[PDB]
Design a protein around this nucleic acid. Structure first.
Lengths: 78, 208, 144, 70
RNA sequence: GAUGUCAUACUUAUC
């Protein structure tokens, strides 16, 4: 309930950059970015776990018009 | 005889300093009291490894040297590079002929510029505290952000020019903050256009 | 041409395939022949510019229904149907003030676009395939 | 290989009663999975926050006693 | 990561 899935991000986006993008709406407790260790590139999806479910729902509902590197980022509940 | 980690965490006043390897030592209470002290330093992480902290950066790329500004402002590095480029093109006969009649005056830049660079133009390096130890991955972990502020790289990636006017310098998602309200995770957060003046708060956020 | 043997910052040789080190130059060429090296090798715009614009006189008629606009257009002699779309009044040629309403505009290729402003928020649907029709036998467009 | 699994401490069965009595094939793997999302989601069902005092906590009763003592 | 034979290379102003 406190974890939100962020998809639609480019491969050039980094985890401190995603943390600084997610900190504009609320302090995130953790951020997990699944990436392949063979090639060293991201998969374009991540999971941001906040300190509460209401703040995570507000961050998921307030990030519906975010554009990173020309690509729109989608936020869903997970 | 040897207590578990739960009993060592419940008996000690600071359970955060207790580890799994301290429960099978010769003195769990003394180790829990010494590890949770004020001026104590923790043990390095290389005591339980199998590479002796020297087999990690084998194939990783490393720079040869990081010259400071005071050493590079004297022109000795360019002269040393020119001398190394001139010496690498000489053969064995040119190296044997220069030993009997050498050519003086290789660089001869100055005499008092080095003393002025080491005494007047001396810069203090970036030191650290005595408690911050070093590790193998300490030179690569540079990720260790503030609400209401954005960096230059994030503004270049998201396409948000930061200016004094509050028309386009806030992100377009903040209108959703005008739709639902302030975030519940930060009650003291002030955004321009909703609860802050637009020409006054030109930083697009303030934690008051 | 070995893509695994590289030079480190100490004047040595490093093999990143098996992660080995070699001090002299004779040990780097002799490290390729072996069991570990063999195991590491085995394991690893045109339609918009050509559109004529003469801006003719349209014939649109509205009617308040309850459960619809009718546009009389001439013969276009083509299979391109006129498309209807709802837009905002924020984008204009002169940008006049106090523009906060929506307008549904129907556009065709030989004719000009006819726009009607809607003061209500949502009273109908501006979809082309849902509640719109275009009779080519009589050349009349209907939008409901 | 068996030598790489014997030198690194792998191929050793370990039971974790916190995350539904899961199985772990390594002490370092269990220590890495303790500060992860799965152990945090397992500990959030009992009501214990994700802190540094419950890192080496395995049983649910000991974790509940450590949460009630703090 | 450990073992057992060979080679390369280094340090303590060693002789």
């Amino acid at each position: 309930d406190a974890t939100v899935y962020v998809g639609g991000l480019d491969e050039k986006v980094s985890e401190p950059l995603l943390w600084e993008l997610f900190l504009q709406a609320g302090p995130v407790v953790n951020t997990h970015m699944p990436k392949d260790r063979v090639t060293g590139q991201h998969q374009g999806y991540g999971f941001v776990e906040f300190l509460s479910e209401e703040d995570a729902d507000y961050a998921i509902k307030i990030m519906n018009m975010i554009k990173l590197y020309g690509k729109p980022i989608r936020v869903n509940k997970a | 005889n040897r207590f578990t980690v739960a009993e060592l965490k419940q008996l000690v006043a600071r359970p955060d300093v207790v580890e799994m390897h301290d429960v099978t030592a010769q003195d769990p209470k003394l180790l829990v009291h010494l590890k949770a002290t004020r001026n104590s330093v923790p043990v390095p992480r290389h005591w339980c490894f199998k590479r002796k902290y020297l087999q990690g950066k084998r194939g990783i790329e490393k720079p040869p040297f990081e010259l400071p500004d005071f050493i590079k402002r004297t022109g000795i590095q360019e002269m040393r590079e020119a001398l190394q480029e001139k010496e690498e093109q000489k053969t064995m006969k040119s190296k044997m002929r220069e030993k009997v009649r050498p050519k003086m005056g290789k660089i001869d830049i100055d005499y008092q510029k080095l003393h002025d660079a080491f005494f007047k133009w001396q810069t203090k390096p970036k030191l650290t505290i005595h408690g911050d130890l070093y590790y193998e991955g300490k030179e690569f972990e540079t990720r260790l952000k503030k609400p209401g502020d954005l960096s230059d790289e994030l503004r270049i990636s998201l396409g948000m020019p930061v200016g004094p006017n509050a028309h386009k310098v806030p992100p377009p998602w903040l209108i959703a903050m005008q739709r639902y309200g302030p975030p519940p995770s930060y009650p003291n957060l002030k955004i321009p256009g909703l609860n802050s003046p637009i020409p006054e708060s030109c930083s697009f956020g303030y934690h008051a | 041409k070995d893509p695994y043997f590289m030079k480190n910052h100490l004047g040595s040789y490093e093999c990143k395939l098996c992660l080995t080190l070699h001090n002299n130059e004779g040990s780097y060429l002799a490290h390729t022949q072996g069991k570990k090296h063999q195991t590491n090798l085995a394991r690893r715009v045109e339609v918009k510019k050509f559109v004529k614009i003469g801006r003719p006189g349209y014939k649109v008629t509205k009617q308040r229904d309850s459960e619809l606009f009718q546009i009389d257009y001439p013969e276009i002699a083509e299979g391109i149907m006129p498309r209807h779309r709802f837009m905002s009044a924020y984008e204009q040629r002169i940008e006049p003030p106090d523009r906060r309403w929506q307008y549904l505009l129907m556009a065709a290729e030989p004719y000009e676009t006819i726009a009607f402003k809607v003061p209500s928020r949502e009273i109908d649907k501006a979809e082309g395939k849902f509640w719109t029709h275009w009779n080519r036998e009589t050349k009349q467009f209907f939008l409901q | 290989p068996y030598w790489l699994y014997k030198l690194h401490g792998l191929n050793i069965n370990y039971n974790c009663e916190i995350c539904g009595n899961y199985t772990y094939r390594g002490p370092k793997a269990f220590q890495r999975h303790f500060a992860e999302w799965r152990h945090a989601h397992g500990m959030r069902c009992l009501g214990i926050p994700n802190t540094a005092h419950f890192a080496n906590v395995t049983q649910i009763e000991d974790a509940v006693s450590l949460w009630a003592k703090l």
